[PDB]
């Protein structure tokens, strides 16, 4: 189809090479994705005298940089300009130049293109396989087999129309998620205008706000000023809304990076606005009529994140393509036996001079067309569709079907304990470090300084309804604190006679700094002066050095707290003395951390889910390896891992990078008793001796020193800890490079990048639907917080893979039987009339459809599905069965031919049509027996799928086929077999026919089962 396009383009107009004036330019799709297309260039007048030829591909604009690069390049977006310049940037000033800029840089239309069902059918009809099929149908027409042609063409067009219908049903959903265009209050020509969403262009300044109609954010915008409560669920999927901070406070020397500064300052498109905080009237700047937060438009068109993902959804694949090498080699092998049969056909026919040659070549081509089954990719699509529909009932969505089959081949599965293996809600047991010893004191008895430190240090927010929403950790601590949080960022104690604390501004968590700070002031008792007190929290290991005064048992108590597995978080509070109002704005975010005072720890219990234990046990029972990738304390992860039996060795040793440069890395055990430096040899012996786990800092050190030993060590490691999001992508890709099929289950925003690159990925959304950033483009998407989705998806993958193997085997045997039977038996002047091979076509169609709908078991088993069709078992069984059936067929033919009386007249009138015979009867009955035997023998039952009797449709179909075979062989009803035009056989030789049929069936069963037993 794609190659068929360029011939038409060449015919319409010649390709043009000269860059002076090109009428049309071919578009290279690139192997990753896309399709071959031709686009007409756009010629525009240049105001400055410089012309640019432009084209649009997938609604993405690219330009020929005739000035510097002399090549096609995408249009540069205003995001690349300096952050400080945009701070100083005012925006456009006049409307004529506004249309000038809109025309010259293009526009953005969030509406998508939905092809018509007729158009979709026409576009699918160009596929090579449908053309091959319709050619074959025409060949059956030419061989006078008119009924055969009409039935096969009807079935093929019916299935293609069914595919088009399900494609249209999917397109209807994409239409449903489409966002209707709407008016927006935007700043242009030094004024505010009512402007529709479609006509927004980058460089515009828009003051967005909480729309009374709950209108979604049109596109990505950069929050210039003000605070806003934004619900990024439908895009990002975090149940916790992410705060947005104004950039006027940001330093001008900073250079904006999308990856680093995405969460707190740039407002993504497609999100829903809940509440916007208006800036103070004292500040001088952009003044909006609607009193909404002013924002700058960075990215538009489909180059925005939501647009990128949904356009990749649309123009990525119409239907899943599975024309892999295995299918090609299957066709090739069946075609090899086809060519052998056809060669015998031609030779034996040419041995006879009387018969026509052109007709003989016609049935030769008929045999060839019959060999390649017209239903070959149809049932692969059917099996994938049935698997998808079955997997749908488990409340789990699948954005892309194609790596569903990859689920069966999984060997190593990755898990995250944060939020996925443990509930995020949890509970707080107390506040530690405020009393002598390792004992944790209740929240009631902790000092008031700890009370204010815990209460102030929170990023929680208040909605219009005022419901408390935020991080479950902060949620739980404030619940223990019990101080009310008001919409005015004032924290009031419920039962404590202390003045409330008003948070002036919040510094949020940074991954690199591993800390966050809160800056606020409290009124002194008996005076109106404002005393600024700042409470901070973060990584205890980082927070230790920043304490000015610290107890000696800090690391000791931290070690024992992490021993229990409870999440430990150090609390800090600095006096800071008295501060002025302006100086509070003056102080930067990295200055609050210095000269801190220790306040104590907090123990945060992580409750391991009970349902986790059974699924982990089952997945280890599946001859699979499980690896833990998480970010908390490494020995905390060790406690979690041993609790779920992730590690079963006598001891486990942690890896640390050495304090001094040039020192060889040395492991230390959890108890610390066993210490051994890393050896250059294989860690297999140590792994047998004890379990190994890697820390994130050690991971970085091993990356920086030499990747080789790291690559050797990764496969045998069970626990990964303190791993930042980039290094999770690192570890997933590293596991993939070893060749093991990778499965990962993640929920947090840190896991998006890793789930992007995993071979099979599932994303879990709490509560609910959120439909997170990953879940848009994750391989799979699950709505249930439990991780039973892992075992369910693995089971479905096993089932679909075994079904595909089954299907290829059935098609191979059945095609070979029908092909050889027809090929030689037409040579003997014995061809099927319309009714009988119509019947066989119905039996094949019905049996294929019923076996396509197999059901799986309830529990998985230790045995592993075969990797693919390319294994010795399949080829050896197909050949052994084929010879076992071939010998029987040859015996039947010779035994019959030794019996039928010869021709009465050598020359037969050409006008005479088919007249019934007995060889017809024997060959058709034997072929039916062979199809029945194929279906009965090759159905692999437990423990990979249900038993043979359980699949009631297939049992009924096989029973009907066997009843038809037995009734025809008996020939009890003369009307019945007369309708089929089958001549009666003498009973003395139904005896032999039945005996040889049973012998063939039993030999096939015994041979196949003994082969399975020997090569299991």
From Swiss-Prot:
Family membership noted in the UniProt record: Belongs to the cation transport ATPase (P-type) (TC 3.A.3) family. Type V subfamily.
Cytoplasmic side: 6-126, 348-809, 853-871, 938-952
Residue ranges, Extracellular side: 148-326, 831, 893-916, 974-986
The protein's Enzyme Commission number: 7.4.2.-
Active site residues according to the UniProt entry: 416
TM regions (residue ranges): 127-147, 327-347, 810-830, 832-852, 872-892, 917-937, 953-973, 987-1007
UniProt GO cellular component terms: endoplasmic reticulum membrane; membrane
Region N-domain, residue ranges: 426-607
Function summary: Endoplasmic reticulum translocase required to remove mitochondrial transmembrane proteins mistargeted to the endoplasmic reticulum. Acts as a dislocase that mediates the ATP-dependent extraction of mislocalized mitochondrial transmembrane proteins from the endoplasmic reticulum membrane. Specifically binds mitochondrial tail-anchored transmembrane proteins: has an atypically large substrate-binding pocket that recognizes and binds moderately hydrophobic transmembranes with short hydrophilic lumenal domains.
Gene, per the UniProt record: ATP13A1
Domain of life: Eukaryota
Comment block on domains: Contains a large substrate-binding pocket that recognizes alpha-helical transmembranes, which alternately faces the endoplasmic reticulum lumen and cytosol, while remaining accessible to the lipid bilayer through a lateral opening. The translocase alternates between two conformations: inward-open (E1) and outward-open (E2) states. Undergoes a series of conformational changes with ATP-binding, phosphorylation of the Asp active site and subsequent dephosphorylation in a Post-Albers cycle (i.e., E1 -> E1-ATP -> E1P-ADP -> E1P -> E2P -> E2-Pi -> E1).
Stored NCBIfam families: ATPase_P-type, P-ATPase-V
Binding site for Mg(2+): 416, 418, 747
Binding site for ATP: 416-418, 509, 567, 632, 747-751
Catalysed transformations (reactions): [protein]-with a C-terminal TM segment(out) + ATP + H2O = [protein]-with a C-terminal TM segment(in) + ADP + phosphate + H(+)
Glycosylation sites: 170, 303
Region of interest (A-domain), ranges: 82-113, 178-318
Membrane-topology descriptor: Multi-pass membrane protein
Matches recorded under PANTHER family: CATION-TRANSPORTING ATPASE-RELATED, ENDOPLASMIC RETICULUM TRANSMEMBRANE HELIX TRANSLOCASE
Alphabetical GO biological process terms: extraction of mislocalized protein from ER membrane; intracellular calcium ion homeostasis; monoatomic ion transmembrane transport; protein transport; transmembrane transport
Keywords per UniProt: Acetylation, ATP-binding, Endoplasmic reticulum, Glycoprotein, Magnesium, Membrane, Metal-binding, Nucleotide-binding, Phosphoprotein, Protein transport, Translocase, Transmembrane, Transmembrane helix, Transport
Protein name per UniProt: Endoplasmic reticulum transmembrane helix translocase
A molecular function (GO) term: metal ion binding
């Amino acid at each position: 189809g794609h190659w068929s396009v360029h011939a038409h383009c060449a015919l319409t107009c010649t390709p043009e090479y000269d860059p002076s004036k090109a009428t049309f330019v071919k578009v290279v799709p690139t192997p990753n994705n896309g399709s071959t297309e031709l686009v007409a260039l756009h010629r525009n007048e240049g105001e400055d005298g410089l012309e640019v030829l432009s084209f649009e591909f997938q609604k993405i604009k690219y330009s020929y940089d005739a000035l510097e690069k002399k090549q096609f390049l995408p249009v540069a977006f205003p995001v690349g300009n300096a952050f400080s310049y945009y701070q100083s940037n005012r925006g456009f000033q006049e409307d004529s130049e506004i249309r000038a800029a809109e025309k010259k840089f293009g526009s953005n239309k969030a509406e998508m293109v939905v092809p018509d069902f007729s158009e979709l059918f026409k576009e699918r009809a160009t596929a090579p396989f449908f053309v091959f099929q319709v050619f074959c149908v025409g060949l059956w027409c030419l061989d006078e087999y008119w009924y055969y042609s009409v039935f096969t063409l009807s079935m093929l067009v019916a299935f293609e129309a069914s595919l088009v219908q399900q494609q249209m049903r999917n397109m209807s959903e994409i239409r449903k998620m489409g966002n209707k265009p709407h008016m927006i209050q935007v700043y242009r020509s030094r004024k505010w205008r009512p402007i529709a969403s479609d006509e927004i262009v980058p460089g515009d300044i828009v003051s967005i706000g909480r729309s009374p109609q709950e209108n979604l954010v049109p596109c990505d915008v950069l929050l210039l000023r003000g605070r806003c409560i934004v619900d990024e669920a439908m895009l990002t999927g975090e149940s916790v809304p992410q705060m947005k901070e104004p950039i006027e406070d940001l330093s001008p020397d900073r250079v904006l990076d999308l990856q680093a500064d995405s969460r707190l300052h740039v407002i993504f498109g497609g999100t829903k606005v809940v509440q916007h905080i208006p800036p103070q009237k004292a500040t001088t700047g952009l003044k909006p009529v609607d009193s909404g937060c002013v924002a700058y438009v960075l990215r538009t068109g489909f180059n925005t994140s939501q647009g990128k993902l949904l356009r990749t959804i649309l123009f990525g694949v119409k239907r899943v393509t599975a024309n892999n090498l295995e299918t090609f080699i299957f066709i090739l092998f069946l075609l090899v036996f086809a060519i052998a049969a056809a060669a015998y056909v031609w030779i034996e026919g040419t041995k006879d001079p009387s018969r026509n040659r052109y007709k003989l070549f016609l049935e030769c081509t008929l045999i060839l067309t019959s060999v390649v089954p017209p239903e070959l990719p149809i049932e692969l699509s059917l099996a994938v569709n049935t698997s998808l529909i079955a997997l749908a009932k488990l409340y789990m969505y699948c954005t892309e079907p194609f790596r569903i089959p990859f689920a069966g081949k999984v060997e190593v599965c990755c898990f995250d304990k944060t939020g996925t293996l443990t509930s995020d809600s949890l509970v707080v047991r107390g506040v530690a470090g405020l009393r002598d010893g390792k004992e944790v004191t209740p929240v009631s008895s902790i000092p008031v300084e700890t009370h204010r430190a815990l209460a102030s240090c929170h990023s929680l927010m208040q909605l219009d309804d005022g419901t408390l929403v935020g991080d479950p950790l902060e949620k739980a601590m404030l619940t223990a604190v019990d101080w009310t949080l008001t919409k005015d960022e004032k924290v009031f104690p419920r039962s404590i006679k202390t003045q409330g604390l008003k948070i002036h501004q919040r510094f949020h968590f940074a991954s690199a700094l591993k800390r966050m700070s809160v800056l606020a002031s409290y009124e002194k008792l008996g005076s109106t002066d404002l005393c600024y007190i700042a409470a901070v929290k973060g990584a205890p290991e980082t927070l230790h050095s920043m304490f000015s005064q610290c107890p000696p048992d800090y690391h000791h108590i931290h070690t024992e707290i992490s021993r229990e597995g409870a999440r430990v978080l150090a609390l800090g509070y600095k006096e800071l003395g008295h501060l002025t109002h302006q100086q509070a704005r003056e102080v930067k975010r990295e200055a609050l951390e210095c000269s801190l005072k220790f306040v104590g720890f907090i123990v945060v219990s992580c409750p391991l889910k009970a349902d986790s234990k059974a699924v982990i046990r089952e997945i280890q029972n599946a001859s699979h390896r499980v690896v833990m990738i998480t970010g908390d304390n490494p020995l905390t992860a060790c406690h979690v891992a041993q609790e779920l039996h992730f590690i079963e060795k006598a001891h486990t040793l942690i890896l640390q990078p050495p304090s001094e440069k040039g020192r060889q890395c040395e492991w230390r055990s959890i108890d610390g008793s066993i210490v051994l430096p890393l050896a250059r040899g294989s860690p297999k012996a140590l792994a047998l001796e004890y379990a190994l786990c890697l820390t994130g800092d050690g991971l970085a050190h091993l990356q920086a020193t030499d990747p080789q030993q790291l690559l050797r060590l990764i496969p045998h490691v069970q626990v990964f800890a303190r791993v930042a999001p980039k290094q999770k992508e690192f570890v997933i890709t590293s596991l993939k490079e070893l060749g093991y099929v990778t499965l990962m289950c993640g929920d947090g925003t840190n896991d998006v990048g890793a789930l992007k690159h995993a071979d099979v990925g599932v994303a879990l959304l709490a509560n609910a639907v959120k439909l997170g950033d990953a879940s848009i483009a994750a391989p799979f998407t699950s709505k249930l917080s439990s991780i039973q989705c892992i075992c369910h998806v693995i089971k479905q993958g096993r089932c679909t893979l075994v079904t595909t193997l089954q299907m290829f085997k059935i098609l191979a045997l059945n095609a070979l039987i029908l092909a050889y039977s027809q090929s030689v038996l037409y040579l003997e002047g014995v061809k099927f009339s319309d009714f009988q091979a119509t019947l066989q076509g119905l039996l094949l169609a019905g049996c294929f459809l019923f076996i396509s709908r197999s059901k799986p078991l309830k529990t998985l088993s230790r045995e592993r599905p075969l990797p693919n069709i390319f294994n010795l078992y399949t080829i050896l069984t197909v050949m052994l069965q084929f010879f076992v059936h071939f010998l029987s067929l040859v015996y039947l033919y010779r035994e019959a031919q030794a019996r039928s009386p010869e021709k009465q007249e050598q020359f037969v009138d050409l006008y005479k049509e088919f007249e019934p015979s007995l060889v017809n009867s024997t060959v058709y009955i034997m072929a039916m027996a062979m199809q029945m035997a194929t279906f009965a023998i090759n159905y692999k039952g437990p423990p990979f799928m249900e038993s043979l009797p359980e699949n009631k449709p297939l049992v009924w179909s096989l029973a009907v086929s066997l009843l038809a075979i037995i009734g025809l062989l008996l020939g009890s009803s003369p009307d019945f077999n007369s309708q089929f035009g089958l001549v009666d056989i003498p009973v003395e030789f139904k005896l032999v026919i039945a005996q040889v049929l049973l012998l063939d069936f039993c030999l096939a069963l015994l041979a196949d089962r003994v082969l399975q037993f020997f090569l299991g």
